[PDB]
Design a protein around this ligand. Structure first.
Ligand SMILES: [Mg+2]
Ligand SMILES: [Mg+2]
Ligand SMILES: [Mg+2]
Ligand SMILES: [Mg+2]
Ligand SMILES: [Mg+2]
Ligand SMILES: [Mg+2]
Ligand SMILES: [Mg+2]
Length: 152
RNA sequence: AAAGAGAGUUUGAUCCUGGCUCAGGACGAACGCUGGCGGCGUGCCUAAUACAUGCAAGUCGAACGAACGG
C-alpha cells in the first residue's frame, strides 16, 4: 500500500511564565512505488504521536509522477520559497543521487534513475516542497496533444 | 551518447542572508609505527654553491718523412 520515510525530528520550544515548554515536530514523506507520493507534517508532545499525526496528514496530499522509461521525462527546477531543486533525467541503472529529503521523495515516488541538485537553502521542509513543485511542473510526451500526433 | 548528493555551527525556538569547518581525488613528497615476494616505472623540487679522484672524442700506414723482425 504505502510506506513511510521519516525525514526529520525537531525539538521545538516555546517560553511561558514558568520557564519554557518543548514539543516535537515531524516531517514524513509517504508513497507507493507505482508513482504516487506526498508529504505531511505533525506536531505533538511525544515523538510517536507526531509520527502518527504526520502519517495521517500526508495521506491527503498526493501527486502523480510521470516516469517514461523509468526516469524523468525532461529537466525542470522547483522554486518554492527559499528552496531550489533541479531534476534531470539519467541513463539506465545510474541510481538516485540527491540530498536527504530529495532522495526520500524521489525514491518513494518509485523513480529508479534520476540525478538532482539543491541550489538554494537546506531547510528540509523547503527542500521537500520545492521538489514537489518541480515534480508538478513535469509533463508527459503522450498527453501533449495540442493538435499533434507524435512528430517527435 | 554525456549529464551535478551534502553536513555541523549565530536563536529560548523560526525563516532568510552570511562566513568558517568536514566528508573525495593527486603527489618527483617528508615525518611516525610496522614490513614477505615478484613485474613495470621513478629518485637534489633547496646553493646556476665549492670540486679530492677515476673515466665521458677520437680515428686513418691504402696521403707522406724512423726503430724491432729478416
Ligand atoms: Mg552553510
Ligand atoms: Mg545574532
Ligand atoms: Mg584533502
Ligand atoms: Mg625489511
Ligand atoms: Mg624488521
Ligand atoms: Mg636543479
Ligand atoms: Mg693496416
Amino acid at each position: 500500500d504505502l510506506e513511510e520515510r521519516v525525514v526529520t525530528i525537531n525539538r521545538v520550544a516555546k517560553v511561558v511564565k514558568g520557564g519554557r515548554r518543548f514539543r516535537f515536530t515531524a516531517l514524513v514523506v509517504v508513497g507507493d512505488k507505482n508513482g504516487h507520493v506526498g508529504f505531511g507534517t505533525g506536531k505533538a508532545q511525544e515523538v510517536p504521536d507526531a509520527i502518527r499525526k504526520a502519517v495521517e496528514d500526508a495521506k491527503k496530499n498526493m501527486v502523480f509522477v510521470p516516469t517514461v522509461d523509468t526516469t524523468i521525462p525532461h529537466t525542470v527546477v522547483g522554486h518554492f520559497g527559499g528552496g531550489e531543486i533541479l531534476l534531470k533525467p539519467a541513463s539506465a541503472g545510474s541510481g538516485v543521487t540527491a540530498g536527504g529529503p530529495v532522495r526520500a521523495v524521489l525514491e518513494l515516488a518509485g523513480v529508479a534513475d534520476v540525478s538532482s541538485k539543491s541550489l538554494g537553502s537546506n531547510t528540509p521542509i523547503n527542500m521537500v516542497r520545492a521538489t514537489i513543485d518541480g515534480i508538478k511542473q513535469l509533463k508527459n510526451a503522450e498527453d501533449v496533444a495540442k493538435l499533434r500526433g507524435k512528430t517527435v
